Each structure stands twice: as structure tokens, then as C-alpha cells.
Amino acid sequence: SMFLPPPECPVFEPSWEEFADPFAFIHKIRPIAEQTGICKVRPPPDWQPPFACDVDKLHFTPRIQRLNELEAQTRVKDYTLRTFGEMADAFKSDYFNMPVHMVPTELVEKEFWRLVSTIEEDVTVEYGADIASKEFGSGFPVRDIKLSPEEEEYLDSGWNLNNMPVMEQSVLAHITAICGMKLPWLYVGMCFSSFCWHIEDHWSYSINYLHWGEPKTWYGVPGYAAEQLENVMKKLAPELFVSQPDLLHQLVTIMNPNTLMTHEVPVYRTNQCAGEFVITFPRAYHSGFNQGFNFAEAVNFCTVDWLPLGRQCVEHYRLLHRYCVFSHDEMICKMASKADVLDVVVASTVQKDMAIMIEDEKALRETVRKLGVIDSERMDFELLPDDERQCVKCKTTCFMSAISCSCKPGLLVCLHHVKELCSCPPYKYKLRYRYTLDDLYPMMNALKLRAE
Ligand SMILES: O[C@H]1CCN(Cc2nc(-c3ccccc3)no2)C1
Ligand SMILES: [Cl-]
Ligand SMILES: [Mn+2]
Ligand SMILES: [Zn+2]
Ligand SMILES: [Zn+2]
């Protein structure tokens, strides 16, 4: 009745030993956590990164948010941290006519789901969401200004979310085509400010650290249930699913987890408190809201586990005509080209994805040859700005190959959409390709040798 809280997601308390390597730990909890989509990680008690900042010199431009269930919001788009904090505390205090710390979390949750469903309540809140910059930087210690011995202890932590991208067992590190994707984002919350249901770009992992303040409430759905959830959402708000001109236009929404649970979508919840991590797994839908004034930091990442899903994701984007953030094939080939310095498990996993890539590309090239595309020319796709190498039809970022025609200068289609480029006969077309099979086998062999 009213709101039934979803069951709690897994909570992990790793020992210092388990904690030492984030990627090893994440890989260990993976069979459990991927069944629930999100999980919470409580660091060992003394792991205590120093948070220090001036509340007066940190400025940011707030986003404004209406709180209506099923209403469309766009995903991405002046206060000091002190003035925001004052605004946020006053808002929560006045809303409940109570001191902020006496408002039970259970009640804020109940009330959140009441207010978003009631058409007549027009509650609007504000929040901060931005990547780290110089006007507003990471809450974790970074290199620059002299650091205390304690800050230095945490400079090179795996769980320092600035390091998380560029680690060894990570995969998106040596891409350097994507700042919006693997720089940490900073989030300043207030009571009821919320993040709509979504999954990460390219079905990556994400990891969120709440530095300080009141808790952040999460709902998460396991990856296997993603398409159930989308079916439920398509039925109840099809407006979210019309095609969009790019990625700065993705439409998302608030939706009661109980609605999902009624349609047999498994949902889990958690309250993330200061000093705790939440991790989301590939293609795991999640959403939530802040209990009060707080400060969080989050970053996307990709493990070796993720590589096959990343390939499936790009295929799914193609079917949906959704824009890519990067070329998955370009990333794989970039790693293959650096096979001698790769982690050995990484090399073994890249090798497997590359073999699939090569088999699929064989098939596609045979097909376009049989369509009467004969002329071909090598092309260094990675040098083209992304907007200059998207398939006209499905918007995929080309890298391995594409079709062009002298008739439509500058336009490309991927090899799935050879018929969609123009009216000219196939003999007027050129296959543009990054590599021959011969180019690829040194790369493949290098991976095999590195992987032993
Ligand atoms: O049969 C006709 C069309 C295709 N073929 C040449 C060809 N290149 C490839 C290839 C596959 C993966 C990576 C690079 C090249 N496979 O075949 C001539
Ligand atoms: Cl409302
Ligand atoms: Mn997210
Ligand atoms: Zn295409
Ligand atoms: Zn043409």
C-alpha cells in the first residue's frame, strides 16, 4: 500500500586484502551483484580518504528539475557549495517542518514516490552535475599545491575514482579519442533531486562514491532484465522512445519501482551513506534520489568481463540507430596494436573479441563484394572526427570499413547499410577499409604470444 520498498541489494564489506585490488574484488562479487544490477561496497573502516574543499570558492551552475513520474527529462546538459547547501537545508527543513537529521529515510522515500505521482504537486528542485574542472575539481586527492601525508596515501588508490580509468585491468584507458565518458562526474544533491532510469553508455560499469552528506537512495535492475524494463516503459511512456538527433538528447524518466515489480521486473534498493560505494553492472538500469544535501563522485569503467557486452551493445545501438560514444573496434585494434604492454589476461580477452570481430568482418566484406562493390581503398578512419564517419542510416561510428560514393561526397554507410547510401549502381561505390586480413594477423599473433 502506498509504497513497498524493493528488497535490499547486496552489501559487501571487503577486508583490506580483498579491498586492495578493485578489479579483482569486483570480479569476485560479480556472480552475486550481476543478479541484482547494483551493489554497495563498504570500504574497510580506516580507509578514510580526506575530503577537503572551500565551500565558498567552489561555484557551479545548477540544473533545475521538475518531479513528475513518467515525464520526459533530458539526460545531460549560479551557486557556491555553501549557498547551495543553505538553499538545500532550508528546503528540506521547510518541507517537513523538521530538522534535516530527524527526517527518517523511509519517510523521504515514501514522500518522494507520493509527490512524483501527484499531478497537482509541482515541486521543483535543483542539483549540480558536471565533470571535474578547475572551477570545481575531484573530491579525491589529485596531483598538483602540496598534499598532506594522508592525501598522498590515497593518491594512488584503485578506489580513487580518478585512477579507476587508467588502471591495468581496465579497458577504456588507452582509448584516447571521450572526456565526457571516463573523467569523473561530480554531483551536488539536495532533498528529492533525482537521477532518472538509465543504463551507462556502451553498457559500461559505473562506480559512485558518496563523499559526504545525507544518503543517496538507489534502485537497480539486473542486466538480464533490461529489455523487460524497456518493454514496461515503452507501454507506459512511448514518448521516451521516439528517435533523437544525438546523444545530448537522450530522454529519460522517473518511474516507481513498484510499477516495474508489478510487471515482473526484479528491482533492488539501497541507501548509500557517506563513505560508501555503489557499483552498477553492465546494462543494469538504475535510478534514485538524494535524501538531502550531499556530494558524490562517479565514473564509468570497463573490465575484461565487459568486452563481449560492449560489442553486443554497439550492435544494439545499430538496430536502434543510436549514436556511439566511441568505436568499439577502434578500441580493440588500439589495444591489439599495443599487445606487448598489455596485461596478460587483458591480452587473452582482447584476442577473443578480435577473433569475433574478424570473422564478422570477413562475412560483411564478402557480402558487399557480392553486391558488386569492387573498387576499394585503405582509409585511416581514426583520423576522422566522429561526425564525419557515422553511417548515414544507423549512425554507427565506422572504423573497420564503410562504403562511399563519388555521388555523395563525405557520406558513409556501414556495410550493413550498403543499399542506403544513394541511387547509383554499386560499381560507383568504394569500400573504404582500415585493415586487410594480412594487417590483422600480426596483431592477433602478438596478442596470442602476449597471452601465452
Ligand atoms: O571476397 C571479396 C570480398 C572480401 N574479400 C577480401 C576480404 N577482406 C577480408 C577482411 C576481413 C577482416 C578484416 C580485414 C579484411 N575478408 O575478405 C574479397
Ligand atoms: Cl508531481
Ligand atoms: Mn548511472
Ligand atoms: Zn549502418
Ligand atoms: Zn551515388
Side-chain angles (χ1 to χ4, degrees), residues 261-292:
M261 296 157 74
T262 287
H263 293 278
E264 285 138 36
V265 177
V267 182
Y268 298 84
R269 77 175 305 289
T270 201
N271 295 314
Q272 170 191 32
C273 304
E276 303 181 333
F277 284 103
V278 169
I279 297 166
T280 70
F281 280 66
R283 218 196 179 174
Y285 269 98
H286 52 280
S287 68
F289 62 88
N290 297 297
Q291 295 269 340

PDB file of all heavy atoms in Angstrom, residues 261-292:
ATOM      1  N   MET A 261       7.972  -3.778 -10.580  1.00  0.00           N
ATOM      2  CA  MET A 261       7.860  -5.037  -9.856  1.00  0.00           C
ATOM      3  C   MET A 261       6.526  -5.727 -10.136  1.00  0.00           C
ATOM      4  O   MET A 261       6.447  -6.954 -10.118  1.00  0.00           O
ATOM      5  CB  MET A 261       8.049  -4.795  -8.368  1.00  0.00           C
ATOM      6  CG  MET A 261       9.439  -4.298  -8.023  1.00  0.00           C
ATOM      7  SD  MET A 261       9.492  -3.390  -6.458  1.00  0.00           S
ATOM      8  CE  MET A 261       9.333  -4.738  -5.295  1.00  0.00           C
ATOM      9  N   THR A 262       5.500  -4.926 -10.428  1.00  0.00           N
ATOM     10  CA  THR A 262       4.164  -5.436 -10.771  1.00  0.00           C
ATOM     11  C   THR A 262       4.225  -6.116 -12.134  1.00  0.00           C
ATOM     12  O   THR A 262       3.527  -7.096 -12.382  1.00  0.00           O
ATOM     13  CB  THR A 262       3.111  -4.298 -10.778  1.00  0.00           C
ATOM     14  OG1 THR A 262       2.844  -3.906  -9.427  1.00  0.00           O
ATOM     15  CG2 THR A 262       1.795  -4.735 -11.425  1.00  0.00           C
ATOM     16  N   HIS A 263       5.090  -5.608 -13.009  1.00  0.00           N
ATOM     17  CA  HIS A 263       5.261  -6.208 -14.322  1.00  0.00           C
ATOM     18  C   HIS A 263       6.418  -7.200 -14.344  1.00  0.00           C
ATOM     19  O   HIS A 263       6.998  -7.467 -15.392  1.00  0.00           O
ATOM     20  CB  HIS A 263       5.451  -5.116 -15.360  1.00  0.00           C
ATOM     21  CG  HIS A 263       4.228  -4.275 -15.573  1.00  0.00           C
ATOM     22  ND1 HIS A 263       3.193  -4.664 -16.399  1.00  0.00           N
ATOM     23  CD2 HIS A 263       3.874  -3.068 -15.071  1.00  0.00           C
ATOM     24  CE1 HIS A 263       2.256  -3.730 -16.398  1.00  0.00           C
ATOM     25  NE2 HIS A 263       2.647  -2.749 -15.603  1.00  0.00           N
ATOM     26  N   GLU A 264       6.746  -7.731 -13.166  1.00  0.00           N
ATOM     27  CA  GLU A 264       7.690  -8.838 -13.002  1.00  0.00           C
ATOM     28  C   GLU A 264       9.136  -8.481 -13.336  1.00  0.00           C
ATOM     29  O   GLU A 264       9.952  -9.359 -13.625  1.00  0.00           O
ATOM     30  CB  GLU A 264       7.243 -10.045 -13.837  1.00  0.00           C
ATOM     31  CG  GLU A 264       6.064 -10.787 -13.230  1.00  0.00           C
ATOM     32  CD  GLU A 264       5.031 -11.194 -14.269  1.00  0.00           C
ATOM     33  OE1 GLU A 264       5.426 -11.554 -15.403  1.00  0.00           O
ATOM     34  OE2 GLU A 264       3.819 -11.141 -13.951  1.00  0.00           O
ATOM     35  N   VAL A 265       9.458  -7.197 -13.262  1.00  0.00           N
ATOM     36  CA  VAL A 265      10.848  -6.755 -13.338  1.00  0.00           C
ATOM     37  C   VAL A 265      11.491  -6.739 -11.955  1.00  0.00           C
ATOM     38  O   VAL A 265      11.063  -5.984 -11.090  1.00  0.00           O
ATOM     39  CB  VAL A 265      10.964  -5.347 -13.910  1.00  0.00           C
ATOM     40  CG1 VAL A 265      12.434  -4.910 -13.904  1.00  0.00           C
ATOM     41  CG2 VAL A 265      10.354  -5.272 -15.302  1.00  0.00           C
ATOM     42  N   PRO A 266      12.536  -7.537 -11.741  1.00  0.00           N
ATOM     43  CA  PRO A 266      13.188  -7.509 -10.426  1.00  0.00           C
ATOM     44  C   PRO A 266      13.892  -6.183 -10.149  1.00  0.00           C
ATOM     45  O   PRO A 266      14.668  -5.715 -10.979  1.00  0.00           O
ATOM     46  CB  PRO A 266      14.193  -8.667 -10.502  1.00  0.00           C
ATOM     47  CG  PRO A 266      14.462  -8.822 -11.964  1.00  0.00           C
ATOM     48  CD  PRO A 266      13.237  -8.407 -12.704  1.00  0.00           C
ATOM     49  N   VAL A 267      13.599  -5.580  -9.002  1.00  0.00           N
ATOM     50  CA  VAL A 267      14.211  -4.316  -8.594  1.00  0.00           C
ATOM     51  C   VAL A 267      14.806  -4.453  -7.202  1.00  0.00           C
ATOM     52  O   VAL A 267      14.208  -5.100  -6.346  1.00  0.00           O
ATOM     53  CB  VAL A 267      13.192  -3.170  -8.577  1.00  0.00           C
ATOM     54  CG1 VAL A 267      13.880  -1.829  -8.186  1.00  0.00           C
ATOM     55  CG2 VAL A 267      12.481  -3.058  -9.896  1.00  0.00           C
ATOM     56  N   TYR A 268      15.972  -3.844  -6.968  1.00  0.00           N
ATOM     57  CA  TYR A 268      16.596  -3.822  -5.656  1.00  0.00           C
ATOM     58  C   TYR A 268      16.831  -2.400  -5.239  1.00  0.00           C
ATOM     59  O   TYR A 268      16.878  -1.517  -6.089  1.00  0.00           O
ATOM     60  CB  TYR A 268      17.914  -4.609  -5.655  1.00  0.00           C
ATOM     61  CG  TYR A 268      17.655  -6.041  -5.988  1.00  0.00           C
ATOM     62  CD1 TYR A 268      17.560  -6.448  -7.310  1.00  0.00           C
ATOM     63  CD2 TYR A 268      17.423  -6.979  -4.986  1.00  0.00           C
ATOM     64  CE1 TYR A 268      17.270  -7.747  -7.632  1.00  0.00           C
ATOM     65  CE2 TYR A 268      17.128  -8.292  -5.299  1.00  0.00           C
ATOM     66  CZ  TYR A 268      17.059  -8.668  -6.624  1.00  0.00           C
ATOM     67  OH  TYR A 268      16.781  -9.964  -6.967  1.00  0.00           O
ATOM     68  N   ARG A 269      16.984  -2.167  -3.937  1.00  0.00           N
ATOM     69  CA  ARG A 269      17.202  -0.817  -3.457  1.00  0.00           C
ATOM     70  C   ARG A 269      18.401  -0.764  -2.536  1.00  0.00           C
ATOM     71  O   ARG A 269      18.885  -1.797  -2.066  1.00  0.00           O
ATOM     72  CB  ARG A 269      15.956  -0.287  -2.720  1.00  0.00           C
ATOM     73  CG  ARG A 269      15.801  -0.859  -1.298  1.00  0.00           C
ATOM     74  CD  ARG A 269      14.628  -0.247  -0.487  1.00  0.00           C
ATOM     75  NE  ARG A 269      14.694   1.212  -0.397  1.00  0.00           N
ATOM     76  CZ  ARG A 269      15.587   1.886   0.325  1.00  0.00           C
ATOM     77  NH1 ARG A 269      16.511   1.244   1.025  1.00  0.00           N
ATOM     78  NH2 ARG A 269      15.562   3.211   0.335  1.00  0.00           N
ATOM     79  N   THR A 270      18.879   0.444  -2.272  1.00  0.00           N
ATOM     80  CA  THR A 270      19.794   0.635  -1.171  1.00  0.00           C
ATOM     81  C   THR A 270      19.840   2.108  -0.806  1.00  0.00           C
ATOM     82  O   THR A 270      19.561   2.970  -1.650  1.00  0.00           O
ATOM     83  CB  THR A 270      21.213   0.143  -1.501  1.00  0.00           C
ATOM     84  OG1 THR A 270      21.913  -0.103  -0.283  1.00  0.00           O
ATOM     85  CG2 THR A 270      21.994   1.195  -2.323  1.00  0.00           C
ATOM     86  N   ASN A 271      20.171   2.393   0.453  1.00  0.00           N
ATOM     87  CA  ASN A 271      20.565   3.746   0.847  1.00  0.00           C
ATOM     88  C   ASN A 271      22.077   3.766   0.919  1.00  0.00           C
ATOM     89  O   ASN A 271      22.673   3.031   1.701  1.00  0.00           O
ATOM     90  CB  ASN A 271      19.985   4.178   2.206  1.00  0.00           C
ATOM     91  CG  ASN A 271      18.467   4.296   2.189  1.00  0.00           C
ATOM     92  OD1 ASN A 271      17.878   4.868   1.269  1.00  0.00           O
ATOM     93  ND2 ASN A 271      17.830   3.758   3.217  1.00  0.00           N
ATOM     94  N   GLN A 272      22.684   4.600   0.091  1.00  0.00           N
ATOM     95  CA  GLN A 272      24.118   4.774   0.093  1.00  0.00           C
ATOM     96  C   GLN A 272      24.439   5.902   1.052  1.00  0.00           C
ATOM     97  O   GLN A 272      24.000   7.028   0.844  1.00  0.00           O
ATOM     98  CB  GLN A 272      24.629   5.093  -1.329  1.00  0.00           C
ATOM     99  CG  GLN A 272      26.105   5.542  -1.408  1.00  0.00           C
ATOM    100  CD  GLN A 272      26.470   6.109  -2.791  1.00  0.00           C
ATOM    101  OE1 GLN A 272      25.629   6.705  -3.455  1.00  0.00           O
ATOM    102  NE2 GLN A 272      27.727   5.944  -3.209  1.00  0.00           N
ATOM    103  N   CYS A 273      25.220   5.613   2.086  1.00  0.00           N
ATOM    104  CA  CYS A 273      25.635   6.654   3.018  1.00  0.00           C
ATOM    105  C   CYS A 273      27.047   7.129   2.720  1.00  0.00           C
ATOM    106  O   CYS A 273      27.795   6.465   1.991  1.00  0.00           O
ATOM    107  CB  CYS A 273      25.557   6.158   4.466  1.00  0.00           C
ATOM    108  SG  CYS A 273      23.918   5.543   4.918  1.00  0.00           S
ATOM    109  N   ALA A 274      27.384   8.284   3.289  1.00  0.00           N
ATOM    110  CA  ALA A 274      28.698   8.891   3.158  1.00  0.00           C
ATOM    111  C   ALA A 274      29.786   7.852   3.414  1.00  0.00           C
ATOM    112  O   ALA A 274      29.684   7.065   4.351  1.00  0.00           O
ATOM    113  CB  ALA A 274      28.822  10.063   4.114  1.00  0.00           C
ATOM    114  N   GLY A 275      30.788   7.797   2.537  1.00  0.00           N
ATOM    115  CA  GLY A 275      31.878   6.840   2.677  1.00  0.00           C
ATOM    116  C   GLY A 275      31.616   5.496   2.042  1.00  0.00           C
ATOM    117  O   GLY A 275      32.416   4.577   2.160  1.00  0.00           O
ATOM    118  N   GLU A 276      30.478   5.351   1.374  1.00  0.00           N
ATOM    119  CA  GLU A 276      30.186   4.069   0.744  1.00  0.00           C
ATOM    120  C   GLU A 276      30.170   4.192  -0.788  1.00  0.00           C
ATOM    121  O   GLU A 276      29.914   5.264  -1.347  1.00  0.00           O
ATOM    122  CB  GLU A 276      28.848   3.497   1.250  1.00  0.00           C
ATOM    123  CG  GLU A 276      28.793   3.317   2.781  1.00  0.00           C
ATOM    124  CD  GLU A 276      27.465   2.734   3.282  1.00  0.00           C
ATOM    125  OE1 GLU A 276      26.415   2.909   2.626  1.00  0.00           O
ATOM    126  OE2 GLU A 276      27.471   2.093   4.352  1.00  0.00           O
ATOM    127  N   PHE A 277      30.438   3.064  -1.435  1.00  0.00           N
ATOM    128  CA  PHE A 277      30.441   2.943  -2.883  1.00  0.00           C
ATOM    129  C   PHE A 277      29.207   2.231  -3.355  1.00  0.00           C
ATOM    130  O   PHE A 277      28.805   1.227  -2.752  1.00  0.00           O
ATOM    131  CB  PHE A 277      31.660   2.140  -3.375  1.00  0.00           C
ATOM    132  CG  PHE A 277      32.959   2.901  -3.342  1.00  0.00           C
ATOM    133  CD1 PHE A 277      33.888   2.668  -2.331  1.00  0.00           C
ATOM    134  CD2 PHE A 277      33.265   3.826  -4.343  1.00  0.00           C
ATOM    135  CE1 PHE A 277      35.098   3.367  -2.308  1.00  0.00           C
ATOM    136  CE2 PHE A 277      34.469   4.520  -4.329  1.00  0.00           C
ATOM    137  CZ  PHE A 277      35.389   4.291  -3.300  1.00  0.00           C
ATOM    138  N   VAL A 278      28.638   2.709  -4.457  1.00  0.00           N
ATOM    139  CA  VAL A 278      27.697   1.892  -5.205  1.00  0.00           C
ATOM    140  C   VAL A 278      28.283   1.527  -6.577  1.00  0.00           C
ATOM    141  O   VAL A 278      28.818   2.377  -7.266  1.00  0.00           O
ATOM    142  CB  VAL A 278      26.336   2.618  -5.388  1.00  0.00           C
ATOM    143  CG1 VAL A 278      25.455   1.870  -6.404  1.00  0.00           C
ATOM    144  CG2 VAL A 278      25.629   2.720  -4.055  1.00  0.00           C
ATOM    145  N   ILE A 279      28.175   0.264  -6.964  1.00  0.00           N
ATOM    146  CA  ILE A 279      28.660  -0.165  -8.260  1.00  0.00           C
ATOM    147  C   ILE A 279      27.491  -0.638  -9.106  1.00  0.00           C
ATOM    148  O   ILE A 279      26.672  -1.440  -8.644  1.00  0.00           O
ATOM    149  CB  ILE A 279      29.683  -1.318  -8.137  1.00  0.00           C
ATOM    150  CG1 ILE A 279      30.924  -0.852  -7.362  1.00  0.00           C
ATOM    151  CG2 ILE A 279      30.082  -1.819  -9.527  1.00  0.00           C
ATOM    152  CD1 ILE A 279      31.824  -1.973  -6.899  1.00  0.00           C
ATOM    153  N   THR A 280      27.416  -0.161 -10.347  1.00  0.00           N
ATOM    154  CA  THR A 280      26.414  -0.680 -11.275  1.00  0.00           C
ATOM    155  C   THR A 280      27.077  -1.528 -12.353  1.00  0.00           C
ATOM    156  O   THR A 280      28.153  -1.190 -12.858  1.00  0.00           O
ATOM    157  CB  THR A 280      25.594   0.449 -11.943  1.00  0.00           C
ATOM    158  OG1 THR A 280      26.419   1.170 -12.872  1.00  0.00           O
ATOM    159  CG2 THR A 280      25.035   1.433 -10.868  1.00  0.00           C
ATOM    160  N   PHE A 281      26.413  -2.618 -12.712  1.00  0.00           N
ATOM    161  CA  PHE A 281      26.960  -3.581 -13.652  1.00  0.00           C
ATOM    162  C   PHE A 281      26.478  -3.331 -15.082  1.00  0.00           C
ATOM    163  O   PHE A 281      25.584  -2.515 -15.294  1.00  0.00           O
ATOM    164  CB  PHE A 281      26.633  -4.985 -13.156  1.00  0.00           C
ATOM    165  CG  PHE A 281      27.568  -5.428 -12.079  1.00  0.00           C
ATOM    166  CD1 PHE A 281      27.573  -4.786 -10.854  1.00  0.00           C
ATOM    167  CD2 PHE A 281      28.511  -6.420 -12.316  1.00  0.00           C
ATOM    168  CE1 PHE A 281      28.471  -5.150  -9.866  1.00  0.00           C
ATOM    169  CE2 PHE A 281      29.408  -6.789 -11.331  1.00  0.00           C
ATOM    170  CZ  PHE A 281      29.388  -6.152 -10.109  1.00  0.00           C
ATOM    171  N   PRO A 282      27.116  -3.978 -16.074  1.00  0.00           N
ATOM    172  CA  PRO A 282      26.726  -3.676 -17.457  1.00  0.00           C
ATOM    173  C   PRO A 282      25.241  -3.894 -17.754  1.00  0.00           C
ATOM    174  O   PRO A 282      24.693  -4.953 -17.404  1.00  0.00           O
ATOM    175  CB  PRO A 282      27.582  -4.648 -18.269  1.00  0.00           C
ATOM    176  CG  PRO A 282      28.852  -4.767 -17.447  1.00  0.00           C
ATOM    177  CD  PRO A 282      28.338  -4.807 -16.020  1.00  0.00           C
ATOM    178  N   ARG A 283      24.644  -2.889 -18.387  1.00  0.00           N
ATOM    179  CA  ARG A 283      23.241  -2.885 -18.809  1.00  0.00           C
ATOM    180  C   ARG A 283      22.247  -2.972 -17.635  1.00  0.00           C
ATOM    181  O   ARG A 283      21.070  -3.281 -17.838  1.00  0.00           O
ATOM    182  CB  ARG A 283      22.971  -4.022 -19.801  1.00  0.00           C
ATOM    183  CG  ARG A 283      22.011  -3.622 -20.924  1.00  0.00           C
ATOM    184  CD  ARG A 283      21.452  -4.856 -21.662  1.00  0.00           C
ATOM    185  NE  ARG A 283      20.527  -4.477 -22.724  1.00  0.00           N
ATOM    186  CZ  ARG A 283      19.995  -5.333 -23.584  1.00  0.00           C
ATOM    187  NH1 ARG A 283      20.293  -6.617 -23.500  1.00  0.00           N
ATOM    188  NH2 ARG A 283      19.171  -4.907 -24.518  1.00  0.00           N
ATOM    189  N   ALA A 284      22.716  -2.664 -16.432  1.00  0.00           N
ATOM    190  CA  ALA A 284      21.854  -2.618 -15.233  1.00  0.00           C
ATOM    191  C   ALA A 284      21.181  -1.255 -15.092  1.00  0.00           C
ATOM    192  O   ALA A 284      21.835  -0.245 -14.806  1.00  0.00           O
ATOM    193  CB  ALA A 284      22.661  -2.933 -13.971  1.00  0.00           C
ATOM    194  N   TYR A 285      19.880  -1.216 -15.328  1.00  0.00           N
ATOM    195  CA  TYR A 285      19.119   0.011 -15.154  1.00  0.00           C
ATOM    196  C   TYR A 285      19.172   0.489 -13.705  1.00  0.00           C
ATOM    197  O   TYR A 285      19.168  -0.329 -12.790  1.00  0.00           O
ATOM    198  CB  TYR A 285      17.673  -0.198 -15.600  1.00  0.00           C
ATOM    199  CG  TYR A 285      17.492   0.146 -17.060  1.00  0.00           C
ATOM    200  CD1 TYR A 285      17.486  -0.845 -18.035  1.00  0.00           C
ATOM    201  CD2 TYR A 285      17.364   1.464 -17.458  1.00  0.00           C
ATOM    202  CE1 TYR A 285      17.328  -0.525 -19.385  1.00  0.00           C
ATOM    203  CE2 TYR A 285      17.232   1.800 -18.803  1.00  0.00           C
ATOM    204  CZ  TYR A 285      17.216   0.804 -19.757  1.00  0.00           C
ATOM    205  OH  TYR A 285      17.072   1.158 -21.080  1.00  0.00           O
ATOM    206  N   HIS A 286      19.249   1.798 -13.492  1.00  0.00           N
ATOM    207  CA  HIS A 286      19.215   2.322 -12.134  1.00  0.00           C
ATOM    208  C   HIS A 286      18.695   3.729 -12.139  1.00  0.00           C
ATOM    209  O   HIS A 286      18.694   4.399 -13.177  1.00  0.00           O
ATOM    210  CB  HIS A 286      20.607   2.270 -11.454  1.00  0.00           C
ATOM    211  CG  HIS A 286      21.696   2.904 -12.267  1.00  0.00           C
ATOM    212  ND1 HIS A 286      22.302   2.248 -13.320  1.00  0.00           N
ATOM    213  CD2 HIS A 286      22.274   4.130 -12.201  1.00  0.00           C
ATOM    214  CE1 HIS A 286      23.204   3.042 -13.868  1.00  0.00           C
ATOM    215  NE2 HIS A 286      23.214   4.187 -13.208  1.00  0.00           N
ATOM    216  N   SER A 287      18.250   4.158 -10.958  1.00  0.00           N
ATOM    217  CA  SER A 287      17.659   5.457 -10.727  1.00  0.00           C
ATOM    218  C   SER A 287      17.679   5.695  -9.231  1.00  0.00           C
ATOM    219  O   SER A 287      17.985   4.788  -8.455  1.00  0.00           O
ATOM    220  CB  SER A 287      16.207   5.547 -11.238  1.00  0.00           C
ATOM    221  OG  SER A 287      15.364   4.713 -10.456  1.00  0.00           O
ATOM    222  N   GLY A 288      17.336   6.900  -8.817  1.00  0.00           N
ATOM    223  CA  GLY A 288      17.263   7.147  -7.390  1.00  0.00           C
ATOM    224  C   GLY A 288      17.091   8.604  -7.097  1.00  0.00           C
ATOM    225  O   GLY A 288      16.750   9.381  -7.984  1.00  0.00           O
ATOM    226  N   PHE A 289      17.343   8.980  -5.850  1.00  0.00           N
ATOM    227  CA  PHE A 289      17.161  10.362  -5.445  1.00  0.00           C
ATOM    228  C   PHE A 289      17.976  10.601  -4.187  1.00  0.00           C
ATOM    229  O   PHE A 289      18.301   9.675  -3.430  1.00  0.00           O
ATOM    230  CB  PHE A 289      15.665  10.703  -5.197  1.00  0.00           C
ATOM    231  CG  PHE A 289      15.060   9.904  -4.096  1.00  0.00           C
ATOM    232  CD1 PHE A 289      15.130  10.339  -2.779  1.00  0.00           C
ATOM    233  CD2 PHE A 289      14.471   8.690  -4.366  1.00  0.00           C
ATOM    234  CE1 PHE A 289      14.624   9.571  -1.751  1.00  0.00           C
ATOM    235  CE2 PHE A 289      13.958   7.916  -3.344  1.00  0.00           C
ATOM    236  CZ  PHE A 289      14.036   8.360  -2.035  1.00  0.00           C
ATOM    237  N   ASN A 290      18.305  11.859  -3.963  1.00  0.00           N
ATOM    238  CA  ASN A 290      19.028  12.220  -2.765  1.00  0.00           C
ATOM    239  C   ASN A 290      18.098  12.520  -1.585  1.00  0.00           C
ATOM    240  O   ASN A 290      17.031  13.122  -1.752  1.00  0.00           O
ATOM    241  CB  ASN A 290      19.911  13.406  -3.079  1.00  0.00           C
ATOM    242  CG  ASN A 290      20.944  13.054  -4.129  1.00  0.00           C
ATOM    243  OD1 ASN A 290      21.788  12.199  -3.883  1.00  0.00           O
ATOM    244  ND2 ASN A 290      20.831  13.637  -5.318  1.00  0.00           N
ATOM    245  N   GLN A 291      18.515  12.074  -0.408  1.00  0.00           N
ATOM    246  CA  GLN A 291      17.815  12.350   0.843  1.00  0.00           C
ATOM    247  C   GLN A 291      17.976  13.777   1.328  1.00  0.00           C
ATOM    248  O   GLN A 291      17.136  14.297   2.055  1.00  0.00           O
ATOM    249  CB  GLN A 291      18.299  11.385   1.922  1.00  0.00           C
ATOM    250  CG  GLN A 291      17.935   9.969   1.621  1.00  0.00           C
ATOM    251  CD  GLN A 291      16.590   9.606   2.217  1.00  0.00           C
ATOM    252  OE1 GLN A 291      16.116  10.272   3.143  1.00  0.00           O
ATOM    253  NE2 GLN A 291      15.989   8.530   1.721  1.00  0.00           N
ATOM    254  N   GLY A 292      19.060  14.428   0.923  1.00  0.00           N
ATOM    255  CA  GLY A 292      19.337  15.767   1.400  1.00  0.00           C
ATOM    256  C   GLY A 292      20.635  16.218   0.759  1.00  0.00           C
ATOM    257  O   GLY A 292      21.154  15.530  -0.124  1.00  0.00           O
TER     258      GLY A 292
END
